[PDB]
C-alpha cells in the first residue's frame, strides 16, 4: 500500500498543510470548507432638492 501518498498519516513530523504536489499527488489532505452568503443588490434611492 503506498505509504508515500499519505504523508500526514505516516509522518509524525509532517506539517499539516504540507504538499509535494509537483512530485506526486497525495490523498487525505487538509481541505477547508466554507459557508458564505450572496445577497441580491439592494438600494434605497433618495431624491435631491
Amino acid at each position: 500500500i503506498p505509504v508515500e501518498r499519505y504523508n500526514i498519516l505516516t509522518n509524525p513530523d509532517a506539517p499539516p498543510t504540507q504538499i509535494q504536489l509537483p512530485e506526486v499527488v497525495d490523498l487525505y489532505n487538509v481541505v477547508t470548507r466554507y459557508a458564505y452568503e450572496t445577497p441580491p443588490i439592494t438600494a434605497v434611492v433618495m431624491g435631491v432638492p
Partner: protein, 98 residues
C-alpha cells in the same frame, strides 16, 4: 446631503446634518420644503411615530401657502393627528394640500 442610518440593537437611528454631524431624532429641526417633497414617502415611515409621541419638532420653511381653518368646542377633547397625518401623507413632490 441627507441620509438615514438605521439603528441596531436598540440604539437610535440617526440623520445626516449639513455640518456632517450625526444626530438622533430629537431637537428642533429646520427643513426646506423641497427636501420633504423629494423624499415625501421615505420620511413618513421614519418620522411620524416620533412626531406623535416623542418631542421631535420640525419647522418647514416655505414662505407662502393657502390655509384651512377648523373650529372646535373648547369644552371637550380635541386632537389633530388625523388632519396632520392626512396632510403629511398627501404631500406630493409635485403638489401640496392646503
Amino acid at each position: 446631503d441627507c441620509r438615514i442610518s438605521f439603528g441596531m440593537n436598540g440604539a437610535a437611528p440617526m440623520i445626516r446634518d449639513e455640518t456632517g454631524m450625526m444626530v438622533p431624532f430629537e431637537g428642533n429641526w429646520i427643513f426646506p420644503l423641497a427636501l420633504w417633497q423629494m423624499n415625501t414617502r421615505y420620511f413618513n415611515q421614519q418620522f411620524d411615530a416620533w412626531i406623535k409621541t416623542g418631542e421631535l419638532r420640525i419647522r418647514i420653511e416655505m414662505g407662502a401657502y393657502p390655509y384651512m381653518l377648523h373650529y372646535y368646542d373648547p369644552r371637550q377633547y380635541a386632537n389633530a393627528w388625523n388632519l396632520t397625518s392626512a396632510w403629511l401623507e398627501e404631500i406630493t413632490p409635485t403638489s401640496i394640500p392646503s
